[PDB]
Write a protein that binds this ligand. Structure first.
Ligand SMILES: Cc1ccccc1C
Ligand SMILES: [Cl-]
Ligand SMILES: [Cl-]
Length: 162
């Protein structure tokens, strides 16, 4: 198991523009296109992303290309964040994957409200952090995914993903 396989399980793969859990136009492997409610805006962002007139449809390869950029960008965002980096640096490899999954799903900004969990993770208080992470809109809206990521932080293993 790894970050790529892990997110591939959490996000799925769709080759045609779809609405995500929040109702936002997405494609591929969790690649958000836009928060605007306009399909057209979405198709424009798509064409800009792919570098071609897609007509709302992409190939598996193109999907994988977006995915690779998105993972990388995620990691890099964490490493450039002063609030984040130090926690991330404190973690083992499996838990780092859990950190990346959250940033990928919610952005650096969505993870901004997790201050108290972050501090718990840094101190390696696993069961405690696991309980604090669950008190969130994230957990309530996407409970199955949230539990997998939480178990991961809690255990430092890929059990939730097997
Ligand atoms: C989002 C994030 C980033 C770095 C460490 C842990 C967490 C939850
Ligand atoms: Cl892009
Ligand atoms: Cl879910």
């Amino acid at each position: 198991m790894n970050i790529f396989e892990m997110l591939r399980i959490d996000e799925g793969l769709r080759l045609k523009i779809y609405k995500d859990t929040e109702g936002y136009y997405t494609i591929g492997i969790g690649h958000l296109l836009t928060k605007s409610p306009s399909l057209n805006a979405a198709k424009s962002e798509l064409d800009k992303a792919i570098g071609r007139n897609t007509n709302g449809v992409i190939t598996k390869d193109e999907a994988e290309k977006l995915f690779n950029q998105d993972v990388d960008a995620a990691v890099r965002g964490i490493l450039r964040n002063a609030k984040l980096k130090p926690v991330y640096d404190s973690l083992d490899a499996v838990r780092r994957a859990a950190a990346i999954n959250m940033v990928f799903q919610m952005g650096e900004t969505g993870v901004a409200g997790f201050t108290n969990s972050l501090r718990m993770l840094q101190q390696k208080r696993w069961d405690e952090a696991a309980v604090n992470l669950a008190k969130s809109r994230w957990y309530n809206q996407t409970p199955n995914r949230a539990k997998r990521v939480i178990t991961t932080f809690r255990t430092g293993t890929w059990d939730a993903y097997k």
